[PDB]
Amino acid sequence: GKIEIIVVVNGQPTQVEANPNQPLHVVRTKALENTQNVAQPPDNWEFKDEAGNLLDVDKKIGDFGFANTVTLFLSLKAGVAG
Amino acid sequence: MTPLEDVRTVALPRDCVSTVQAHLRSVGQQGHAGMALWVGVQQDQHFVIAETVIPAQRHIRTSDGVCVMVPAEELHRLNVWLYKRGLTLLAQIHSHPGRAYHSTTDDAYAVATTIGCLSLVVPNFAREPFDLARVAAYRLDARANWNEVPSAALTRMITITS
Ligand SMILES: [Zn+2]
């Protein structure tokens, strides 16, 4: 009952295997580690689906109604320089 | 495969320097910092910069100065765009009102988030022509620290072509 999620971070995909009872934040941590995206910590990133909706990171993966071949975009909440 | 961390040489088109300079100079005329991004294709230990992106951005006055902020909607747009185009984000570039360095804010909120990415800081609102020996450059390590790349190492790394 594992679910395959392609997570895209700065344009780079990583496939993360997920179980239905895992919150989405579990996949966030894994995708950032897999893609070496470290300059801001995991809580500073958020998920959007292909339709562009912001996803609740605390919701269980099985509750979204993903199809087996889902792509999600994981992007920063904010970028600042000065 | 070869991580971005292991890039040793970078091809930087002069046109991509010009696009950065024009943006930084333009907003600098209003006393504001600007931000630009270099994207391209990684060829293992070489990186070819293909384009400059000027992200949608806002300019806000802080207690000790000015900052440039990129909103969430634009960071999402950039992610999707890089994915569709098969491009990689190598570098961010921003300007300072005076001397160039990486501030504590710069250290904490970078857009170029991958181990091995570069963050270049252009002094004096980019008033003078861009010069790799005069910028302050930093590279992100595996423990999320932005460490200075000395000028001599930066010029060995990056070659500007025409
Ligand atoms: Zn700065």
Strand order in the sheet with B66-71: A78-81, B66-71, B58-61
Strand partners, B94: B35, B121
Residue in chain A nearest B102 by alpha carbon: A82
Are B142 and B155 contacting, i.e. CB atoms less than 8 angstroms apart? no
Phi-psi category of residue A43: left, alpha or beta, with phi > 0 → left and psi -120 to 50 → alpha: alpha
Structure-token pair, residue B73: 């909607």
Q: How far, in Å, CA of B103 to CA of A53, rounded?
A: 34
- Among the partner-chain residues B62, B79, B110, the one whose CB lies closest to the CB of A11 is B79
Method: X-ray
Q: DSSP states of chain B as a string?
A: ---GGG--EEEEEHHHHHHHHHHHHHHHTTT---EEEEEEEEETTEEEEEEEE----EEEE-SSSEEEEEEHHHHHHHHHHHHHHT-EEEEEEEE-SSS----HHHHHS-S--BTT-EEEEESGGG-SPP-TTTSEEEEE-TTS-EEEE-HHHHHHHEEEE-
What resolution in angstroms, rounded to 1 decimal? 1.4
B 47-106 residues inside an 8 A Cβ radius of A: 55, 62, 65-72, 75-76, 78-83, 85-89, 92, 94, 103, 105-106
H-type alpha helices, A8-76: 24-34
Residue A22 CA from chain centroid, whole number: 12
- Interchain contact, A82 vs B66, CB within 8 Å: yes
Whole-number Å distance, alpha carbon A16 to ligand 1 midpoint, is 35
Q: Among B67, B114, B140, whose Cβ lies nearest the Cβ of A10?
A: B114
